[PDB]
From a paper:
Twisted gastrulation (TWSG1) is an evolutionarily conserved secreted glycoprotein which controls signaling by Bone Morphogenetic Proteins (BMPs). TWSG1 binds BMPs and their antagonist Chordin to control BMP signaling during embryonic development, kidney regeneration and cancer. TWSG1 is composed of two distinct, disulfide-rich domains. The TWSG1 N-terminal domain occupies the BMP type 1 receptor binding site on BMPs, whereas the C-terminal domain binds to a Chordin family member.
Numbering used by the authors:
A (entry chain A): 397 to 501
B (entry chain B): 398 to 501
C (entry chain C): 25 to 49, 53 to 77
D (entry chain D): 25 to 48, 53 to 78
Amino acid sequence: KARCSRKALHVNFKDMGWDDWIIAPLEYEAFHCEGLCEFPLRSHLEPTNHAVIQTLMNSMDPESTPPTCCVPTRLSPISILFIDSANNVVYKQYEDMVVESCGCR
Amino acid sequence: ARCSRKALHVNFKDMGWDDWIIAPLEYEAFHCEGLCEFPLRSHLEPTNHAVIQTLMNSMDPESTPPTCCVPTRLSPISILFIDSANNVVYKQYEDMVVESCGCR
Amino acid sequence: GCNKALCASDVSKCLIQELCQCRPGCSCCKECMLCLGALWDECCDCVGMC
Amino acid sequence: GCNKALCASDVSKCLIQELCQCRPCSCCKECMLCLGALWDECCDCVGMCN
Ligand SMILES: [Ca+2]
Ligand SMILES: [Ca+2]
Ligand SMILES: [Ca+2]
Ligand SMILES: [Ca+2]
């Protein structure tokens, strides 16, 4: 079981039933964040003070305090061409579509 | 049951920090815990990535794991402590108390 | 009232379009129904807009 | 290595004081001051052993 890390996550819009409104792209690489969050956190990644304290408490007693969680801490956009609710054709940059870094929070 | 803010009392002596923190002796930090499943409540201010991952997890939980409940807003507290050089310092520490939780 | 098997796809579609996010305490109450279409009946509870 | 039992509290102390959060190395020496007698035993928890 690895420490918190960015990992593959392929998104297929047709698989998700979004081919009836998304024209392009039909797939993209989104990534996801998963893995152990335990003392020591990767300190060069600047975890929040809260997460440092919570990780210390979870190391003190993992039966009393739960661990922090591996999540996206930076994300980036992709552009999508799609048909909106009103049948306009739209090319739009969707924010926060792709994980760029993971971290324990 | 869903992602929410729960109590978490921090006692500095219990963690070994009494030798350098003068005050306060303890504070309420809170923590974030609970399920992140479809539908993510828009009060969880979810990112687009989380909405997508949540939909994928809902469709095939064996292939895609759920998003996770974490702090999304935090507030500070002030601490009076002794630093490594033996100065006494009163300082606001950022990101010490959970104000809101959300699936990310 | 929220059929997660029936509703997850189209409800998520509307969310990432930043629809069905205004609280009814209402602005988007209608642009949400437009996005859900026939599934407004079967999926309004998924966002409580009813 | 990094003895978690021996190091967790003192390393956490240094982290929340915003020390030991660089990489090889500017902040190297204020981190060492903060870990003090535990530098040998714990420098690996923050990757500063040089
Ligand atoms: Ca569809
Ligand atoms: Ca101590
Ligand atoms: Ca219908
Ligand atoms: Ca020593």
